[PDB]
Structures are given as C-alpha cells and as structure tokens.
C-alpha cells in the first residue's frame, strides 16, 4: 500500500539476502586465516544475525580484512533495515494522529 510499508517490506527481503550472502562470503574470506572461527556456514548465518541486530556476543567474529568488510555491510544493512521499520511505524502513527485531530 503506502510507500513506508512497501519500503519496510523491501528492506526485510534485502536484509535476508544480505544475511545469506554475508554468511557465504564470511566463510570464504575467513578460511585460510590461522585461528579464525567464522568458518562453517551454520554458525556463520547465526553470526550474521547477531551482527545485523548489533548484539555481537563475541562468540564469533571475523579476523581478516575481507571478513571485516563483509561484517560492516551486514551491520549497516541491519541497522538501516530496522531503522527503516521504525520510520514506517512513525509515519503510521503520525497519519493516524492527524486523523484523530481531524486534520
């Protein structure tokens, strides 16, 4: 319907795509680095989610330049996506309040 709802939907789909690609790319970037732990896909996908939500427990993280670059993309995609949802909620509340005031 409205632009904000559409944008929020698209952002969520975009995020899921970034989570999957980031998981795949993180493993590709980290294998070959002695000591790295972000090296199998199941846990890499878990890592991508706790990174996108900015929780970052510290159980897993990248040690290489390219793994870190991948991490930044996931971080920004998560922060932006969740932020966009907040903006969509605000727009919805603002429209409803204008109606309620009879504006």
């Amino acid at each position, epitope marked *: 319907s409205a632009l904000h709802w559409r944008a929020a939907g698209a952002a969520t789909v975009l995020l899921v795509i970034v989570l999957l690609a980031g998981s*795949y790319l993180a*493993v*590709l970037a*980290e*294998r*070959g*680095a*002695p*000591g*790295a*732990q972000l*090296i*199998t*896909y*199941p846990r890499a996908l878990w890592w991508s989610v706790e990174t996108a939500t900015t929780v970052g427990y510290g159980d897993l993280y990248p040690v290489t330049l390219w793994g870190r670059c991948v991490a930044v993309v996931v971080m920004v995609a998560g922060i932006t996506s969740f932020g966009l949802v907040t903006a969509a909620l605000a727009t919805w509340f603002v429209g409803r309040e204008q109606e309620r005031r009879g504006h």
Partner: antibody
Amino acid sequence: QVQLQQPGAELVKPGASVKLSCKASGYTFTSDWIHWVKQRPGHGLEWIGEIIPSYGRANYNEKIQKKATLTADKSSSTAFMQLSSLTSEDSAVYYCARERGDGYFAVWGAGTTVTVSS
Amino acid sequence: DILLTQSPAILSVSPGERVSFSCRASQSIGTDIHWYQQRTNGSPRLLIKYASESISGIPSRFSGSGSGTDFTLSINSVESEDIANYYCQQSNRWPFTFGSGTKLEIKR
C-alpha cells in the same frame, strides 16, 4: 553410488610432477569444499588443503612445504591436485574428501597411491 | 593451529568389553570434534560428528562424549570388525587438524 572417484595409482620420477583427479557425484552444493589428505605408509592422516569449487578459492596447510596446487572443473564436477617436483618423501596415498561446509568429511575417495621412483 | 593428542597409541581389550579412545585438544573447542575409523587398506569412515552425534549406518555400539578440551569415543562390547585405527579431527578453528590416531587390538 561412489561419491568420489580417484585413480588407483600414479608413478612419478623424482623431480617430476603429476596431476591427481577426484570426480564427484551425488548432491553438489555451492557450499561444498573438496579437501585433500596425505597418508604415508604406516603414518597418520595429514591435511593438505581445500578448495571451494563454486568460487575456485583454495587454502593450504601452512605447516608443511607447499607441493600442491588445487583447481576444479565445475562442468565435469572434478577437483584436481597438482603435485610438483616430488621426492621419495612425497610417496603416499592421497585422498580427496567432501565437506558440506559444516566441518566434517562425510565422504572420502578410495585414494591414489603415488610412488616417486625412477 | 590446534593440536589434537590421542593417547594411548594402542588400546588392547578383550572381546565384548567396553573400550574408550581419548582425544585432547590444545585449547577449548566446544563440541567441534569428529571421529573416523580406518581399517587396514581402507579409506577413513565418519563415525561420530560434533562429539556425540550419531551417523546413519553406524552400529549403535559407537558413541562419543565430551566438550571443551577432552573428548572420548566409546565402543560398547567391542568385536572383531572394530579392529582398526581411529582418528579425531577438529573444525573449531582454521585450519582443520587431525589427531595422531589410536589403534584397537583385541585379546582373543
């Protein structure tokens, strides 16, 4: 059916090189990695390296002298290992194994016995 | 690189008795340990994954346990076909590494 097919043997003259092959069957995923393991007679298993066919990137064991170069042919679903300038120290059984990106070697090839002799 | 220590190198047991193989990691690796069986002239065969997960087609007398640095592969009532070399392998940190292996011998 046999998931990984490797030739039974290869005779190599000292100083020369050889190209081992590992043909894969069964399910193939973008997350699959093909590994190579070396086993000298009477000795244990030694990891040589790995390659991800979907991207073509390979990594190698840093603890040993690099004698191998890994490549893969996506169309023929075959992984290759080029061993160069071999010595008698390189005589052994070389296995290829498939890992689904989750850390363990689910299936192994029969192994190729490489003998370095004149 | 993670060092996996398997000791003793040879384990002797009487037929039907329970036996346990030891694998110790140089640092804590959760449950990222896998076990393989290799008979004379054969290729390694996956027995247990992630320390204790059973694999389809593997006899029920095989089980694994442990976490952190100490792991164990156990065989309930060992039999002739169990005669082989057993290796542990870790996938917690790059690169993957193998233990030196332990041989099982039966006293008949």
